[PDB]
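Limitations

Structures in this collection are predictions, not experimental determinations, and the ligand pose is part of the prediction. Treat each record accordingly. The example that follows, with 5'-O-[(L-lysylamino)sulfonyl]adenosine as the small molecule, is included so readers can see exactly what is and is not provided: the inputs are given verbatim, and the output is the predicted complex.
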Amino acid sequence: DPSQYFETRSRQIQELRKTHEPNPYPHKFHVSISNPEFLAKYAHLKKGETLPEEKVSIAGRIHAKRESGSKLKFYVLHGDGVEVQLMSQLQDYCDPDSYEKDHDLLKRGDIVGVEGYVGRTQPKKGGEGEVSVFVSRVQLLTPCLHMLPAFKDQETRYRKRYLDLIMNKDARNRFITRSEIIRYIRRFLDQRKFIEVETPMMNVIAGGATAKPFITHHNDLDMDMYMRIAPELFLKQLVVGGLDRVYEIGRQFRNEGIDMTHNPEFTTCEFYQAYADVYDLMDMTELMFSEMVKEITGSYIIKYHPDPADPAKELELNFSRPWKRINMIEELEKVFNVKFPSGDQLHTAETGEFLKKILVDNKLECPPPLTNARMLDKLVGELEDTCINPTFIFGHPQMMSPLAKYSRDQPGLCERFEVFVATKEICNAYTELNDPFDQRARFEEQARQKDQGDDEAQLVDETFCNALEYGLPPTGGWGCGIDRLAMFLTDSNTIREVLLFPTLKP
Amino acid sequence: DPSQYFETRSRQIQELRKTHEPNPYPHKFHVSISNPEFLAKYAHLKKGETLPEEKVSIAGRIHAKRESGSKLKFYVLHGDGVEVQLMSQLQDYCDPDSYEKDHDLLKRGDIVGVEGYVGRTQPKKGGEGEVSVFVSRVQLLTPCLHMLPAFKDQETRYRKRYLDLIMNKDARNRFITRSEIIRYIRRFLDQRKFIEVETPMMNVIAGGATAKPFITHHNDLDMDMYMRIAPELFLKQLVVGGLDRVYEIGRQFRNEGIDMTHNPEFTTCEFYQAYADVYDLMDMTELMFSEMVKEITGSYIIKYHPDPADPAKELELNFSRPWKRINMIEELEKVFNVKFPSGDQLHTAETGEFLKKILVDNKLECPPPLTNARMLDKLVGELEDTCINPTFIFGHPQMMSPLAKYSRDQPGLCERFEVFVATKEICNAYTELNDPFDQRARFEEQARQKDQGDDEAQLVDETFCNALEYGLPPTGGWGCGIDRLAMFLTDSNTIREVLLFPTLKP
Ligand SMILES: NCCCC[C@H](N)C(=O)NS(=O)(=O)OC[C@H]1O[C@@H](n2cnc3c(N)ncnc32)[C@H](O)[C@@H]1O
Ligand SMILES: NCCCC[C@H](N)C(=O)NS(=O)(=O)OC[C@H]1O[C@@H](n2cnc3c(N)ncnc32)[C@H](O)[C@@H]1O
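Predicted complex:
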């Protein structure tokens, strides 16, 4: 029957394309007022009151149609996230000889334009009225050839996102919220005289993060190229150039598997501020995010539901300042009740045995290669799993942070922090390593990590090294995951529901 | 000697990293006031007047250093696009025993922080004074290991953009202007209740334009994918979903050669508005662009210098409304003094012979394949080459516009326009083709164009065709080249000077 409806409506519309008495695909319809403005402009009307002088013209998609008798029909239009009811008595219709022929063509799902006047209906059985258009003329703008469903399934909603947006309206709101998150961040940085810049997405070396890149080829120059995994190395060059405050909100490309917090392409905001350090960035972060949550949510506290198998599970995310701050190695010592190496020894093979002994005793599986950086990163997860409120984890070792500046007092650690919300990492920031001598050392250490099997290690970029030799000022850098911010502010348990068209496993 | 300077400064700084008496790479310096704010706050000072009570602390890069005698030195700092002079008498220096040792370490090009008070110098020979910092303490923040040049060359500036920004400051301004163009467009659309969205950059089918795409591979899913050449087909699906007004400012990827108006990756703004048509878009375009030019330039008229071999050549770009409007085929008939086919016959092989006869008689070389769409596109160039002011070219044929809606009165043409400025195409817009029956026809016609050798033809996307069957309202679509807008508003004769890091021919 769905196939029968599609074939019947197709032949009907196809005939109208030849005959053009209704002209099923007209060019222009003049909308006098949007549906939301319509409902707000005339909400003051009392139940039963009408203004026949107030002529309007609106448009939208038919979501409901009912007809009682032959001289009365009702419609419900969806438009701009608002539902508007139409009432078409025959005494209100201009040209009553066209009344029945104009209506019989309209089916549920069609885009229609309608003219008429304003009034609030008076139900005999339910009361409270409804601001409606008292139809004088109705006109088909675009016919819907398919029968719309009466649709829970998840991964069909991702291939036909447009159908999801038609049927739910719940999806529509969270993508608007995602837009508002991005515009809040731009406002925050623009007001601080940041310059919005754009750096290449196709590079000969993909640096600035630890990830596997996408590869492509430019035919005209017979040149293989990597899709960028981060804009970091370019943005620091701009700061070397004199652009003291830059930021970029764009797409990243990382060749990794899909899960509830990972997409092969995703949006991240990175900003760089000269003459600031981590402690400036820590105050910037919790000022920006706490006040963003209150402005968008209405409260400093969010109720998040992480488990899709148990929607009753409720987490309470308190973004109130000050945020909890913890030192990584200090708390790792408390988690496992053991004194860790000094910190300048965290790269040694003796430390590697120490880390693996903790992993196998606690039955924590670390996928190979078992470099000290990866093994420790797995151990840090035991800290992340109790960070519900936004929590700073500070003091990453140097073997894990090839581009973060060494700590001014703690020997083997870096001035670096990550923020975790509901156990997920939402942003990464540190004091920019502006020391070309130490930078070379970190790049050599990464090269040795790749020698033991870590293909995602960050090897040296000599142009970036040249910029550090000309001089990068003391600056602070910062990067966040926009998609993950959208998850927690829209109460989405998966990243595939804050992405309009998520990467499809075909 | 440049190598000798780099090796000498390296050994010197390397020693300071061990000794740490100066500590060549300190962590944090507290800037009391930015250099531009400094020059504006104290510009009221008269020549010779000082305020020893007003203590400041600023930072920047040394661009000039002079020393007269042993107790007086001058510096000139560059910061935030502003140049500030430092005066360091020994009577002003706190701890005079450190005065000479603190200064001798500083070389031209170093990032330094400086403290002192405010005053305007009084030159005995040149007058007019200069608001200066009367130094009490100077401190090295980042040493510059390389000798800066005394630098015209072009393509070395693209590989070391940071060096370009250090030496010129002329480059710095046009990238700020480019930022202001993007933010003007966002303001224009945001004020009209547009939603800023993001659509995939990695698709299984790259549609929405006529171009050759980049190909890549996702390992986890063993899946080949195309980098997007346009977001159009996704944005129309959002309008089918109920997002009546959407826009996206992001990167496009087209595998084509580099020239003065083409980069393999470039930024384009596309917006889609339901219930509007070309004539709405034409007024939107010349309202947005004319008022953007006046707000950013200060005038409705721009002086553009297109030829790099002849910088004296000056074009006058008048963005005043109304803009000139011309019909494509109507003016092509006047250009060649010949009546063109009816328009519904422009796809036929008889028309193909007609087009080639014009091309070979006028010695216009069209690279194969010689499809009617390509041959006509070459002929249209003869119109483009006299469009100095922003000019609409309206009425493209259907064989050239597979996604533009057919004209309501002109049989074989589409409601489509392109805007040309100084003979270059800056934007492309039309009435969205919301007719799935005719859309299939256009996709079949493109498939036949590919059969005759046009590998860039737009073949069918069946998911997008499904969305049109559910119903796309009558909408108008619009797309512009941000990089090309930046060229004309910054007086840049090549696209590689409005791109921070342009694609490098290695
Ligand atoms: N100089 C200071 C550091 C700047 C940030 C650094 N360049 C960077 O790339 N950070 S990152 O940790 O690699 O990623 C940034 C954030 O993006 C998010 N992210 C990372 N990978 C993904 C994926 N795959 N999908 C979605 N979001 C992701 C996550 O919240 C991260 O904290
Ligand atoms: N539905 C209305 C039409 C929307 C626009 C359509 N999707 C589109 O892609 N237009 S385009 O003509 O293919 O490109 C848009 C603009 O981008 C610019 N452009 C195109 N190719 C390049 C390249 N290679 N570099 C820089 N700028 C470029 C140029 O000004 C074009 O007018």
